[PDB]
């Protein structure tokens, strides 16, 4: 059994824009999206 709640930064990997969008398909009501052109992706950052 593990149940921890996380409110912090999400460091990521080089994914495509479509793969980032498909990752954040379930996310967008619990998070903030920020695009990174240097890694050509997005970054999800989820709240409490």
């Amino acid at each position: 059994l593990v149940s921890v709640f996380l409110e912090k930064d999400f460091a990521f990997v080089v994914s495509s824009e479509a793969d980032a969008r498909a990752f954040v398909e379930f996310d967008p009501e619990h998070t903030v999206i920020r695009p990174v052109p240097d890694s050509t992706d997005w970054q999800v950052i989820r709240k409490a």
Binding site: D9, V32, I33, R34, P35, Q43
Partner: protein, 44 residues
């Protein structure tokens, strides 16, 4: 005399100061979205 290690050290400390400020200063970034590709396809 490869100085690139301490160059990355001062860049990492600088970006750490950035990440220290950025979340409690409530300066929201990444509020933009690439939209222009979406209406360009029904135009074509």
């Amino acid at each position: 005399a490869a100085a690139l290690s301490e160059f990355t050290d001062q860049i990492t400390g600088r970006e750490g100061v950035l990440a220290s400020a950025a979340r409690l200063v409530l300066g929201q970034l990444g509020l933009d979205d690439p939209v222009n590709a979406l209406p360009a396809a029904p135009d074509s």
